[PDB]
Each structure stands twice: as C-alpha cells, then as structure tokens.
Symmetry: D2
Subunit: 234 residues, 4 copies
Amino acid sequence: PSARDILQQGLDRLGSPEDLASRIDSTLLSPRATEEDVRNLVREASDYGFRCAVLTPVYTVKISGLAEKLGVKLCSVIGFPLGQAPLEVKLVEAQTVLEAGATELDVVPHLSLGPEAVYREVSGIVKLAKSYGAVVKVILEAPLWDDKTLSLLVDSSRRAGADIVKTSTGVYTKGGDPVTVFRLASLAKPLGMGVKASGGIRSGIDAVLAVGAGADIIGTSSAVKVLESFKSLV
Amino acid sequence: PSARDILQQGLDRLGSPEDLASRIDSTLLSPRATEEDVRNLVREASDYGFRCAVLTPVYTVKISGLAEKLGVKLCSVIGFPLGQAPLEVKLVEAQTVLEAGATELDVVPHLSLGPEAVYREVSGIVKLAKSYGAVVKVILEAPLWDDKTLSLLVDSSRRAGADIVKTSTGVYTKGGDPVTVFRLASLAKPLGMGVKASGGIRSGIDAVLAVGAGADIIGTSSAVKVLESFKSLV
Amino acid sequence: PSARDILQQGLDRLGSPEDLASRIDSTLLSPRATEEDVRNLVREASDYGFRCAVLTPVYTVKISGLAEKLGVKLCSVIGFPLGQAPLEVKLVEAQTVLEAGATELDVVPHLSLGPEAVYREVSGIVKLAKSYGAVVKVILEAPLWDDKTLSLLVDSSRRAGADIVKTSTGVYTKGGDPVTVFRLASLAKPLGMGVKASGGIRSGIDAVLAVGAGADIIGTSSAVKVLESFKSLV
Amino acid sequence: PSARDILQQGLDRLGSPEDLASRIDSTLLSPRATEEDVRNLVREASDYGFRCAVLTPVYTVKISGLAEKLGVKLCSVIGFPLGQAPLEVKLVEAQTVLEAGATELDVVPHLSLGPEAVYREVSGIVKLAKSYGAVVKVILEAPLWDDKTLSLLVDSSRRAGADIVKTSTGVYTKGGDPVTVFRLASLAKPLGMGVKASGGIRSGIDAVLAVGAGADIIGTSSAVKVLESFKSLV
C-alpha cells in the first residue's frame, strides 16, 4: 500500500468519533494503577462508548461488579507482558478472570519457544475461553520477528482457534505504527482474523493511521485523549 | 482542525510523488557529512526533482559548482543550529554563501533575546538576502514557546520581511509533527507567509501529515526514504 | 554519604573479579530468549562463578537438570514484571519452580494496592518458599515511590519475613544507579535485610558503584560484560 | 585501566569539593537561555569557585562587564555546535569574543573535512587566540570516530598549537562517560595536552569518574548540582 492508501483507508473507516470510540480498548496496565484509577477507567469507558476496558487480572476481578452494572465489557491480559509462566499458571489466571465475568483475553504466549509451542499453548487457552464464550486476542510482539516468523505465529494462532492477533504488549515493543500494523494485517486478514494495534497510540491521528493500516481494534492507555485529539488536533 | 481534516488536507495537496518531491528541501546537516556525501545529496536532489538542497555554509560553497551544473537550487542554514553568534557574524556567513550562488537561507535567530531583538536581527539578514533576490526562512523552534510567544515571533518575522517561517532546527526541537506544524501555520498563513516543517520527518506519511497541517515545504535528512515511503509503505 | 563515600565503599568491598562475580545474579528475562540462550546463561554462570542464574518460571524448569549438573543455583522471577496477577496465581507459579529445584525467588508483588496488601501477599509466598528453604527477594520498584512510601514497602517486606529487597524490575523502572540503591539500602540494612540492585547495570563501574551504595547483590543481563568491564575499561 | 583504577584515580585527584569546583567549567548553551540566566551563571561561578563560565558568543560579550567585576574567567564556544561555518566566519566570531575579554575558546572545527583541514583551521584560530593570551580547547566529538581517526584529530590539534582537547559538544554526541574520556586522554596526555570531558555530567559521581578517566576539566550545565551531588549523594 502507498502512504495515500493508508490515509484514505483510515478515513473510509472512521467517519465519526463514535466509529473511533467503538474500536478503542481503553487500557490501564501500570504498576502505579490504583483501584480508583480502575474505577475511573470503567466509568469513562461507559461515558465515551469505548469497546471495552483492558485491565490486569486482579483489577479485572475487583472491578467486574461495577463493569457489569454499567455494561462495560472487560478484557484481561494473561501472562502479560513477558508470557513465560507455564501454561498451567496462565490457565489458573485466565480462569479467575473468566469466572469474574471477563469476556475477552489479551494473551501473551511464550513466543520464543517457537510456532508449535505457541500453537499448543494458545489452543489450551482458547479451549478454556470458548467455554465462557470469551474472545481471545494473541499478542505476537510483531516488531521482534521477520515476516516468515510472524506468519508462522499468525498461523499457529489461527490453528489454535484464536479470533484476533495483537501487534504488541506495548512493553517489550510498540506496535501502533502503520508499518507494524500492516505487517500483521497483511497476514491475519486473509485468514479471517481480527487485528489489534497497540503501543504508543496517543493521538486521534495515530488511531486513524493504525486503522487505515488494517487494525480493527485500537489498544491505548490514552483513550480519552486519542478521542479528543481525533475531534480536534489542538 | 480535526484529525480527519489534516489527513484529508494532506491527501488533497499531495496527489503524486512529484507533488511531494517538489515540496522537499533535501537536507544534510551532520558533523559526519563529507564532501562525498554532499555530492550525493545534490545529485540525488537532481535525480528526484527535490525542491532544493539544504546544507551548511561550507558545503554550500564547496558544492555550488556542481549544483549549478545540475540545476539544483541551494539553501544554506545560517547561525545554525544554536543561533547565538552576533548578527555581524551571521551576516558574514550569509554573505559568503550568497556570493557562491545560494538562493535561500534557513536562518536561526537569537530567539531567547525576545521578539523585538529577533525583528531587528532578521530585518538585517533579510536586507542582505534581498540584494541577491534570495528567500529567507526563519527558524522559530516552535516547540519551545506557547502560542502567545510564537505569535510574537511570527509577527516579528513578518515585520522583518521574511518569506517563510520554519518550525524547528531538528536539533534542539523536532517540529515535523502535525500539532507543531499547525501551531505555526495557524499564525503564519493568515499573514501570507510560507511554512516549512522540519524535524523527524522520516516517512512519506509524516510528510503528508505535515502538509495537511499547513506545511508548504518539507525539510528532511531522509528525502529519498520519505519519497519511496510515500510510494510504498513497506 | 558523599560521592567519595560510595566510590570508596565500592572499592573496599570489591577487591577482585571473583568478589564481583560472586555477587552477580546473571540474568536473562527477554521475550526473545531461547532454550539455547538459557543453556549458555547457565553454563557461563558456572564458568564465571556467578552467584546464580535468574530466569523466568518456564526456563527455570526446563534448565533445572543442566543447572543441577553444573552446580548452578537457580533463581526464578515470580509475577514478573507487572505483578498484578492474584496471589493464587503467583503461588502456583512459585510452587512449580520450587518443585524443580529453584532456591531463590525474585518476587514482584502487587505494589500499587498498598503496604498492607504487599505485607499479606509477600507473607504468603515467603511461607511457601520457606518450606523449600528458598530465599525470597522482594522487588519494590523504588524509583516509583518517595522515601515514606518506600519505607512502608521495606517494612512490609521485613514483617512478611522476606530476606532481600530488590530495587527494580529493570522493566518499569531502572534501579541500578547509586541514588536508587542507597535510597533502598538506607532503609533495609538497618533492618537486617539484604539489598539487590538491578536495572541498567552494564559496566564493571556500574557494579562497583551499586555495591558502594549498599547493594549486596547485583542483578544484570550483561553479567559477562560487567565482569570483563570490571577488569578492563576498554 | 581497570574499573578500580578509574575509581581510585578519581579519588586521588578530588579530595575536596574545592578541588572539584576548580575543575568545573560552568556552562549555559541553551536556545532558551536569557540574559538573566547568564547573570546567574556568572554570579554562581564566583559563589562556588568554578573554573570559568562557558557561554555562547553573544552572552559572553553581554556578560563580560559583570564577569570582569567579579573576577570570573569567560570561555566562549566558537562555531558551536556543528562547526561548519567557514574559517573566516569563526575568526570574526572569535575576535568579537576576544575583544570583549574572553580568555578561553571551546572550538568546534569542521571535523568531517579531515585531519589536515582541522590542522589548518585550528592553527588559524590558535594564532588569533595567542595574541590575546587566550587558551583554546578543541572539541573532537570523540564518540563519532574510531581510535585511528581520533588520534589523527588529537595530533592535528597538537600541531596546531592547541592547549586542550574536548570530548564532545554535548549536542551531537555526549562524552562525559569514563570510556570516551579515557579514549581521548590515552591519546592527549602523552602529548602534554589537557583534557576536557563534557556531555551528560550531572552528578558528583559522574564528575569524579570523568577525572579518574583522565579529564582535567569538567564541562557541565549542572555545575551547582554536580557539586552538591559530590558533597551528598541524596
């Protein structure tokens, strides 16, 4: 795609602030995040109509009550952000979050073990997830691998039953840029998988470019600012 | 302007690679730059049809012969990048480059001395530049000032007779982003002055966004990559 | 302490490369780390006589056989690096690594829930660790808190029965610098707890400075370079 | 040298705060620096006994009166920080500063033109400088070149009549670290040239390590903090 292609595609897909808001997974995954910050995250998600609230396992559970009351979908990260705890540990972690009402999981598999291990690991998590009717997004840290390796990873995710593939944890890499988004999307979309872009998305512009590049969902810890920035540059 | 506004404005103005190449001030201002590098810069500027080649005073002089032969317009930075040498020094520097054939000057005034001082100083080099029919672009390091102060600097530049105002040196600040570009453009355009965006412009998308925000000229040390990036994202 | 004080204290404690190597927790906690990399880490730990090898739960388990064969002590990070999975999850994770032979745990508690919560949580893993005669190092992300808050965290760690307190995860903060190390040490040592410095320790000089500031143990992903750098600056 | 060597050497040379203060060239070379900041720089230089005040040409001239009254030696940067204005322009610049009372010049030659050009250029500046009994420090941007090239540069400076060689402009590179300081010192000292380290020196510790590595003079824009940091770590 050309530069013009990505800009035009973004414009074709985001006609209104509501369109953008509906694609944003409002996130809070900071070592400093308090219960108060989490409450504010969920309330604002409802206030602005964001796709869902993304939290760590503990806060997902603690805030599930309020989220249910306000009708805010909850997404929890799993084995995040390093992803090198054993499969059993991630399942116990996913279980507690699923039992609490979380309907989506942003999973970090043990990527460095290779495509086959990722397939076996993700399949195990998707299995638990399906029993709750939960959606699984697989974080692939795309900036770390070449295309051949990213393809193998996307394919293992597909074969595992995953719905969406995510570009980055936003910790070890950043994947909110058009190039990284396109690298993942050019592989995921043909297979019918959704695409989530995350990492450094701070402006409405950043958001529109990511969508134009192929992202279906926008992950960001600055959801409100991204939305306001979309409406007005300054 | 909204995020959509700047994207659309960028698309409306840059329909072809030629349109882009025509607005690009291909630059080389590095402590590592060699004569060989400069020859390559000027030759490729000719190859790609870039707006001009931007160089330091010494290389502007050394390459003037080649530039003339290949029909490449030359632009020299003056008092770059700190701008705290006295006017007398800057005038001697400009005089030498003008004597060599440079038709544009990207001047860094002693900004921190205040709007009035900038007015007097720029009025001086503009007077000199005019005798050679050369254009003057005033670098204002926009990211350093609030809107009130930037307006004062833009106004002084206008009063002094300058043609264009530039967002940044790319050294002490980076002003290639849409917000910075708009901040300057919103003030300068109503006054009939041109706007040049510089600082961190590495992709074709960066270029299109800067133009959409109001930049007439794009300054970049990666002219070739920006152009190729414009044609193909990856 | 004065700058001279920390330098002198560092020199007084590290007379030989062996003294240094003996205080180094050779670490590998990367999303890119492969089994091969881990084998190399453990083998070189043996070669250089490093204090132990620090790994993620999965690799701690996979390498336990080799580690035992080469007589390399194993330390696993727990709930690393964000620490916001519930205690139950962290306990399962620790249990598996302890079952494999790990004798030390570098634990990341859910710091942002407050001192009291940290006390209860750490008391839990310490109880488990004790049944295996394993040592527990509590990561406090010192750079994130003021002295009053850090003191509260140090005190909770002490009350919970932890042996050592660690300055940082090396991910959300970097705590290998003398100031951070002293901030922690000034609080922990008077309480009889050990101090581990981690985050950005790349040179032998970084190591000596951290020890001079009060670090008993040095955590680093560049163990070999730190040692060689200790022997020769260049 | 070993890590211990550099720490011990620093301690041998900096026994008191006064020792450190006497080696510090208190600097202010910011695009934001105002006349008020400059006055404060000079007053404090006297207050703490720093070696001298380092300023841009314009401020050197504007503050010379006060500096003379307080007995504060003045050092001006020349052709700083890019160094690619012609020799004649730098001489006019050096002249105005010398005529004002500046007794030291921190010169940035056009390094990328090669050793021979640097020799011819520096000789020209040293010539003007000697007539005022002024000292010349030649900035070599050491981090940019290999040892062979740095040696050629140090030798051209020596042959040119320069007194001191400086590691960095602090703009295009940073040379306050032990490694970079040693690289320059191991070449300069045998030839009897002084050594100035600059770039990122913010702590008393940073200062002591640089001296231990061979720096005779410490350039820093945080002179007061470096000195206070030397006396007390926190």
